[PDB]
Write a protein that binds this ligand. Structure first.
Ligand SMILES: Nc1ncnc2c1ncn2[C@@H]1O[C@H](COP(=O)(O)OP(=O)(O)O)[C@@H](O)[C@H]1O
Ligand SMILES: [Mg+2]
Lengths: 506, 57, 51
């Protein structure tokens, strides 16, 4: 067509200019390749973590700079590159396109357009490795993030800027809760107030291309692709792609954050990123530190997740909410990679396989799922109702274990046990069903205030739907008041109490 | 502007232009509903009178 | 219709790619070596002189 011709002419003119300018400013001869790591001679004054051009066409980057030989990890298939290939250096640190044009576009780790929808329009290029903001640039997490899960994700919130972990086994709902959060962000990014929009960005690292295709299909089915970036590295490409894709997603997240906007990033299954770094380090001549893992895995998780922060008003008040995901084996949260990531994050969301198999689709264990925004960085309506409900539910679980231990004044005779079991049955959700914050307070308020003593565990599922229909049909006054105010006052508390003990009889 | 070789946008535009008057709305709830309602208030006033006099008795 | 047109653009692009590679193979056979060798030798000479 017309555009390819002029684009090709302009770019080849620039190519001739580059070839005729300063020679190439450095080169190298390939000494070894394999598993996406390539040794190369030359490159005497190569910059650290610097992109390099290979004669075949594969990209590269410099993790290691030995005397004489340079450790280059190959960005793509290593089949094309051979021995003696000339390795031109790009002259700049590893970068990735960042800007508002990445919205609605799927790109690789390097930022090149892979969805085939056209070129990427970026305001600038940001380094994949960027130092995290300092103490003063960081701000206390106070702005809520509407997870839309109608579960413990609401009573103990996420908030804007938290790196709330999502631990659990495979196929437990980590990607499910991530996509529900992304879908629920549509209600707030579909407006005009940029201070409340959450421009999501997905990191589908170590995810099969069929799965990510289904994920993007589901996103655009719900009109969620307009605000979500799917920068990722599937299982098809090499390990360095997997290692760098979350970091470039972090770069996009800081671009959104440094511009005063709020972005939600979900590092889906960082485990493949860690093992990709393992694959790099095994043949890059970096000895492993512990449990066959190189020591720098904790450091890389640190730099990647600490970039996620809530900026202060001086820096633009931007937020970079992070939702890291780890795939543990057999629920072993005491393994190495778990221990580091649970110590790297601001709380976690446990998703055990037994709860998923039991029937609870969210499958979240209240007892261990903690956060640093307890009754903070919430709407306010939910924070007053269930500011300390997690501890009560944990004590309910302990007493229920204690209740089965011996026959005493326990079981149904315990008001705490009854309230805990009713609340645990309350905290459930179906996938692809984002529930707004307004239709979440009455259920938890009925649970916490002991209004569910005579509703029975089996009937709580129907009670949820009946109560929500009650509010959305003939009690929309207080519901809309809560939604618009973002808080339940004395008037709103009294109205909600009126509704709940009027509907307790049904 | 998204489509270049449309060849169909005029056809669908005309089809929707000719489709908006689907048919006349019924709005004819005045043949059995009205009779039911008439009987409703008639014997409802009758019942109100009888319960009132029963209360006085 | 818009996604059909997008597929049309993609197939036109890949047909252009096939035409480009076919013309590259054609250039691999015709005597198109000495003139371009002189041309980019002069280009590299000018590149050296420019610095
Ligand atoms: N109501 C529900 N909530 C969550 N997941 C559901 C629900 N109903 C069915 N599922 C299934 O649970 C699966 C979630 O798997 P997922 O968490 O994406 O795996 P992984 O943890 O490896 O990313 C989906 O494939 C979906 O088919
Ligand atoms: Mg998944």
């Amino acid at each position: 067509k017309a555009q390819p011709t002029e684009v090709s002419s302009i770019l080849e003119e620039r190519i001739k200019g580059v070839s005729d300018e300063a020679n190439l400013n450095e080169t190298g001869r390939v000494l070894a390749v394999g598993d996406g790591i390539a040794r190369v001679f030359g490159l005497n004054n190569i910059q650290a973590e610097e992109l390099v051009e290979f004669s075949s066409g594969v990209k590269g980057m410099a993790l290691n700079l030995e005397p004489g030989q340079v450790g280059i990890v190959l960005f793509g298939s290593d089949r094309l590159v051979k021995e003696g290939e000339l390795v031109k250096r790009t002259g700049n640190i590893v970068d990735v396109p960042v800007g508002p044009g990445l919205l609605g576009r799927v790109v690789d780790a390097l930022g090149n357009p892979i969805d085939g929808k056209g070129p990427i329009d970026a305001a600038g290029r940001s380094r994949a490795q960027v130092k995290a903001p300092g103490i003063l640039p960081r701000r206390s997490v106070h702005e809520p993030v509407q997870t839309g899960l109608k579960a413990v994700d609401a009573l103990v919130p996420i908030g804007r800027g938290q790196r709330e972990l999502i631990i659990g086994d495979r196929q437990t709902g980590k990607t499910a809760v991530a996509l529900d959060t992304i879908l629920n962000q549509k209600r707030w990014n579909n407006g005009s107030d940029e201070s409340k929009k959450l421009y999501c960005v997905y990191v589908a690292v170590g995810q099969k291309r069929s799965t990510v295709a289904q994920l993007v299909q589901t996103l655009e089915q719900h009109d969620a692709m307009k605000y979500s970036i799917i920068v990722a590295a599937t299982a098809s490409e090499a390990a360095p792609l997997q290692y760098l894709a979350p970091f470039t997603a972090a770069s996009i997240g800081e671009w959104f954050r440094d511009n005063g906007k709020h972005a939600l990033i979900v590092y889906d299954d960082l485990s493949k990123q860690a093992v990709a770094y393992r694959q790099l380090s095994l043949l890059l001549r970096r000895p492993p530190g512990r449990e066959a893992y190189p020591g720098d895995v904790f450091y890389l998780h640190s730099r990647l997740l600490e970039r996620a922060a809530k900026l202060s008003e001086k820096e633009g008040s931007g937020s970079l909410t992070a939702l890291p995901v780890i795939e543990t084996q057999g629920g072993d949260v005491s393994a190495y990679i778990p221990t580091n990531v649970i110590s790297i994050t601001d709380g976690q969301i446990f998703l055990e396989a037994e709860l998923f198999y039991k029937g609870i689709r969210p499958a979240i264990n209240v007892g261990l799922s903690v956060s640093r925004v307890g009754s903070a960085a919430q709407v306010k309506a939910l924070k007053q109702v269930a500011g300390s409900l997690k501890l009560f539910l944990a004590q309910y679980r302990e007493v229920a274990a204690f209740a089965q231990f011996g026959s005493d004044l326990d079981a149904s005779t315990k008001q705490t046990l009854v309230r805990g079991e009713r609340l645990t049955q309350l905290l459930k959700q179906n996938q692809y069903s984002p529930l707004a914050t307004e239709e979440q307070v009455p259920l938890i308020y009925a649970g916490v205030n002991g209004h569910l003593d005579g509703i029975e565990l089996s009937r709580i599922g129907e009670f949820e739907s009946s109560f929500l229909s009650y509010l959305k049909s003939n009690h929309n006054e207080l519901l809309t008041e809560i939604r618009e105010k973002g808080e339940l006052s004395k008037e709103l508390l009294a109205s909600l109490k009126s509704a709940t003990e009027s509907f307790v009889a049904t | 502007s998204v489509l270049k070789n449309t060849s169909v946008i005029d056809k669908i535009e005309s089809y929707v232009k000719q489709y908006k008057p689907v048919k006349i709305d019924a709005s004819k709830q005045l043949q059995v509903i009205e009779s039911f309602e008439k009987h409703a208030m008639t014997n409802a006033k009758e019942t109100e009178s009888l319960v009132s006099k029963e209360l006085k008795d | 219709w818009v996604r059909y047109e997008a597929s049309l653009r993609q197939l036109e692009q890949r047909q252009l790619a096939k035409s480009v590679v076919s013309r590259v193979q054609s250039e691999l056979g015709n005597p198109k070596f000495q003139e371009k060798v002189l041309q980019q030798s002069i280009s590299e000479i000018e590149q050296l002189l420019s610095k």
